[PDB]
A paper describes a structure:
BTN2A1 consists of extracellular domains (IgV and IgC), a transmembrane (TM) domain, a coiled-coil domain (JM), an intracellular B30.2 domain and a C-terminal tail. Although BTN2A1’s intracellular B30.2 domain shares around 50% sequence identity with BTN3A1’s intracellular B30.2 domain, our isothermal titration calorimetry (ITC) assays revealed that the BTN2A1 B30.2 domain does not bind to HMBPP, in contrast to the strong interaction between HMBPP and the BTN3A1 B30.2 domain. By contrast, no such basic pocket is evident in the corresponding region in the BTN2A1 B30.2 structure, explaining BTN2A1’s inability to bind to HMBPP. The monomeric BTN2A1 B30.2 can form a homodimer with another molecule through crystallographic symmetry, with the dimer interface burying an area of approximately 1,924 Å2. The extended C-terminal loop in each monomer contributes to the homodimer interface. Analysis using size-exclusion chromatography with multi-angle light scattering (SEC–MALS) confirmed that BTN2A1 B30.2 forms a homodimer in solution, and truncation of the C-terminal tail blocked homodimer formation.
Residue numbers in the entry:
A (entry chain A), B (entry chain A): 323 to 521, 526 to 534
């Protein structure tokens, strides 16, 4: 019955080597330059060619959703994939291969990353909802400005656990995976209440 | 751990008699005129003076949130209350009486319905999130345009179950309680997917 508002954190062991994750692993950009790191170049979990990264959490049942900020990113993909998807080479990001996606490519939105399913959106998307109903075989996408439906993929027998999926098709342009709401978690609330609480990859550059 | 994105439906047995609920009990307005109905004028669950209505579901544990559309409503209150709150006469809608609220009154937003806690918001709110962390004693409010925090009430020992709470301080102006996202639930998904799916109290009037 209950819809889970997921708290998505990225899995750095899946991330293509050109992706730079925030310290909190909740935002990611593709950087043109290398950061000297501790990370294995080509462990089997890692996407080696497609500039992709997965959420750490997998879902095997139930209803789940999360939201992604994509303003100022010209090329991106969001959605869900099987935990078993192929990671190596020029993987086709299509349902038949275990990927259920929404893409921005060359100023258009494409259902299931298909040049034959251009979605006739009438505004630039800024915050996209990704929705999963596992048993119903449903991956759906929402415009979170007005909570309006964008697309539901053809219904699928997922069979294995699925994970949040992300692709960055352009450089120097971060996406932000919106944390689940937490209220005042961890924060002292004064006797009159806590007002307008505020707690970035936007400042990451290579011109130091 | 998990945040519940609640699907809130109103309880008509709590609603002040001047409130008119949509057929699906997910939106409400205060109407100046009577609708000939089947409803008891003054059952003990019903607010008799404060123009208020509760959600049907109560929460005794965990983290929960829901969202409310309030555009074009000049006077409204949203929040959480104890299931045990007083229903009769001119109840003071304050924490000490079991009400944790955010109010729009006379062009200002007021924390806990207090004329002494005017919130310095810099935009007109359109969609408000109401958040509960029961064990942490937390009722929080969010601006869902950008998922920004507005206010957390002083932390409270709720003790008994709590319910969604709504007040309509003006006439002919509906609030819409946003349904939990459902993807394509109940809807046939064509072989190419389902595109831009669309499924009102805005048309309710007394000039027939
Ligand atoms: Zn960099
Ligand atoms: Zn009416």
């Amino acid at each position: 019955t209950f819809l889970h508002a997921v708290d998505v954190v990225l899995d750095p062991d899946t991330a293509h080597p050109d992706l730079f994750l925030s310290e909190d692993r909740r935002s990611v950009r593709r950087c043109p330059f290398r950061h000297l790191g501790e990370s294995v170049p080509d462990n089997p979990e890692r996407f080696d060619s497609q500039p992709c990264v997965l959420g750490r959490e997998s879902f095997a049942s139930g209803k789940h959703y999360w939201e992604v900020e994509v303003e100022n990113v010209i090329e991106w993909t969001v959605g869900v994939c099987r935990d078993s998807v192929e990671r190596k080479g020029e993987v086709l990001l299509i349902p038949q291969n275990g990927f259920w996606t929404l893409e921005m490519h060359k100023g258009q939105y494409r259902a299931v990353s298909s040049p034959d399913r251009i979605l006739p959106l009438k505004e630039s998307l800024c915050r996209v909802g990704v929705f999963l109903d596992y048993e119903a075989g449903d991956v759906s996408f929402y415009n979170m400005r007005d909570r309006s439906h964008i697309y539901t993929c053809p219904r699928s027998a997922f069979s294995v656990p699925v994970r949040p999926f992300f692709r960055l098709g352009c450089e120097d342009s971060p996406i932000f995976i919106c944390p689940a709401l937490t209220g005042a978690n961890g924060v002292t609330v004064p006797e009159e209440g806590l007002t307008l609480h505020r707690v970035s990859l936007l400042e990451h550059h290579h011109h130091h």
